[PDB]
Amino acid sequence: EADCGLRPLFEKKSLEDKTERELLESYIDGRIVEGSDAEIGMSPWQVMLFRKSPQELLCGASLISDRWVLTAAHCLLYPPWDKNFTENDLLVRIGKHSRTRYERNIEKISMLEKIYIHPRYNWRENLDRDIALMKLKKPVAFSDYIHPVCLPDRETAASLLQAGYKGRVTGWGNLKETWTAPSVLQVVNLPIVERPVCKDSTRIRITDNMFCAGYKPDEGKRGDACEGDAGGPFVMKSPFNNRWYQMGIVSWGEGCDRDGKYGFYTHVFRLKKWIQKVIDQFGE
Numbered sequence: 001e002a003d004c005g006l007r008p009l010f011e012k013k014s015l016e017d018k019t020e021r022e023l024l025e026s027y028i029d030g031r032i033v034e035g036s037d038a039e040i041g042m043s044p045w046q047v048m049l050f051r052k053s054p055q056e057l058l059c060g061a062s063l064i065s066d067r068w069v070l071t072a073a074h075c076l077l078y079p080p081w082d083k084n085f086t087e088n089d090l091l092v093r094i095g096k097h098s099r100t101r102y103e104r105n106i107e108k109i110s111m112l113e114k115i116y117i118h119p120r121y122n123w124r125e126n127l128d129r130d131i132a133l134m135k136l137k138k139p140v141a142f143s144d145y146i147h148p149v150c151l152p153d154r155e156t157a158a159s160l161l162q163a164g165y166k167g168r169v170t171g172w173g174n175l176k177e178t179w180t181a182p183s184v185l186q187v188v189n190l191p192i193v194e195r196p197v198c199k200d201s202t203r204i205r206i207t208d209n210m211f212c213a214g215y216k217p218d219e220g221k222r223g224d225a226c227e228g229d230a231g232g233p234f235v236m237k238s239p240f241n242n243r244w245y246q247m248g249i250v251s252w253g254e255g256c257d258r259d260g261k262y263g264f265y266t267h268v269f270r271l272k273k274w275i276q277k278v279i280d281q282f283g284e
Ligand SMILES: C[C@@H]1CNc2c(cccc2S(=O)(=O)N[C@@H](CCCNC(=N)N)C(=O)N2CC[C@@H](C)C[C@@H]2C(=O)O)C1
Pocket: 074, 078, 125, 126, 127, 175, 178, 179, 225, 226, 230, 250, 251, 252, 253, 254, 255, 256, 262, 263, 264
């Protein structure tokens, strides 16, 4: 996308969201709290993936063009639970801040033309390459509240996706609500963890198409990956062109809020080839 990574209400407008300068600095602070209410238009690529019959929220996602939504394959397909949603079992709302409040002339809704899951998406073991692209029927117009997010390049992925560096999840606590055995848009900034540690922390076979984020718990923080939503986006603001890049789809995890457990994600850049191939050779 020629226009992405720049929020209409922020970067385009010289203003900067309260908690962002702790992302560029990747500098951790003296606070127990981590996530709270997210401000108006703080993430204009956030997409609400819905089930049709009955009506319910499934996953979060991301607008990348006026045509393509990006998400975790699991949201659409999981045969251990015979979960196979077709194009017309699902819909999307964009520009939503309040979970239960229609903002007039502001929020949009759309049905899907087609669904594209990854071919060697290993849903049989560890949800390898948990990625999926959704094409829209009627295309959406970018306003102040709807804007596409950027995709990483080789320089950005090498320079940003390292341990200690920080990223950000946004959602509506779907996850938290689903596995607690909540209202307006949530934002919680998490740091990237060492792949040596990611492995170490889980009994489950991980791949390079996967990375983890969270806090090692000898530095007691209340920063949990469950305040967002499944299939949601992981984003990191680049200090080389101000642009916000999506780095990892919220993939999977063990339990939720606990010491020395981290949210694993799809390695977006590592699959940059696939995503782009379908936009270049299928839509428009
Ligand atoms: C290979 C994975 C391993 N784990 C699981 C699987 C399936 C069902 C439930 C689990 S869970 O209990 O460990 N945890 C849930 C919820 C925890 C969310 N953690 C995060 N920090 N993201 C989960 O990972 N998943 C991912 C797979 C889907 C199918 C169910 C469920 C979810 O709703 O996100 C398959």
